[PDB]
Structure 1
Amino acid sequence: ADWEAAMLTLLMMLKVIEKADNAAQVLTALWFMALAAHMAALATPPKLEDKSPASPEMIDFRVGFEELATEIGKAIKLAALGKVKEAQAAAEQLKTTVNAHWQKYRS
């Protein structure tokens, strides 16, 4: 799975979260977000493969991507604790982090 596959999975799963009804689905969808972010952890967007693993421009991508992953884990939390709507509220701000990270590296 390359970078744009996981990001499109994140964006699609966020739509499944806002349209879900129970806590099992939002926990299921958030875990897929964690799964998609886990598979593309070592991946590189098609914009930065010509920039070094030690370059600040791509290490920006490394902190921003793992910042996305830790916010997902905070959202998986409230879904597991039963707070299904605070998780959906946390998933709404998560879409901001997903949208911003995707736009500056997508096409």
Structure 2
Amino acid sequence: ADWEDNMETLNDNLKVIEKADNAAQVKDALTKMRAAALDAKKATPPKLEDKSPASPEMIDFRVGFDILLWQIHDALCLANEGKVKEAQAAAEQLKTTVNAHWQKYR
């Protein structure tokens, strides 16, 4: 449900970044990604729906989103200094982390 919609939002803004030209477009898209990742962090993903809220699996899930958030931050920092090409290359690796998380927990 809502976790899946957050995953899709992350992918949409990744495509937005991959087809961007100036630094402010990349920044806007990464900011939307950060918001979607934070919204997903509080969800219970489909694979873990049968586990206790107190399970170590859910803590690992949430810390994985913290890792994604610091990767988003690095891309955003590159974009905020006008390094558009480097920001887009960092976002290419974000595609991996985002969709690996998607595929791990769906």
Query: Is the TM value for this pair above 0.5?
Result: yes
For structure 1, the residue ranges without an aligned partner over 5 or more in a row are none
TM-score (norm. length: structure 1): 0.90
Q: What is the distance in 2 between the residues matched to 1:89 and 1:22?
A: 14
**1:89 corresponds to which residue?**
89
1:75-86 equivalent positions in 2, closer than 5 A: 75-86=75-86
TM-score (norm. length: structure 2): 0.91
**2:62 corresponds to which residue?**
62
1:1-107 equivalent positions in 2, closer than 5 A: 2-106=2-106
Over residues 59-102 of structure 1, what are the superposed CA-to-partner deviations in whole Å (9 max), with x where a residue is unaligned?
A: 22111122111111111111111111111111111111111111
For structure 2, the residue ranges without an aligned partner over 5 or more in a row are none
Identity rate, percent: 75
Q: What is the distance in 2 between the residues matched to 1:46 and 1:101?
A: 12
Using the TM superposition, give the Cα deviation of residue 40 of structure 1 relative to its aligned residue in structure 2, in angstroms.
2.2
Q: What is the distance in 2 between the residues matched to 1:103 and 1:2?
A: 15
Q: What is the distance in 1 between the residues matched to 2:46 and 2:96?
A: 22
Q: Are 1:2 and 1:44, in contact at CA under 8 Å, matched by a contact in 2?
A: no
State the aligned residue count. Answer: 106
Using the TM superposition, give the Cα deviation of residue 58 of structure 1 relative to its aligned residue in structure 2, in angstroms.
2.0
Would you tell me which structure has more helix in proportion to its own residues? Answer: 2
Kindly report structure 1 stretches of 4+ aligned residues shifted beyond 3 Å: none
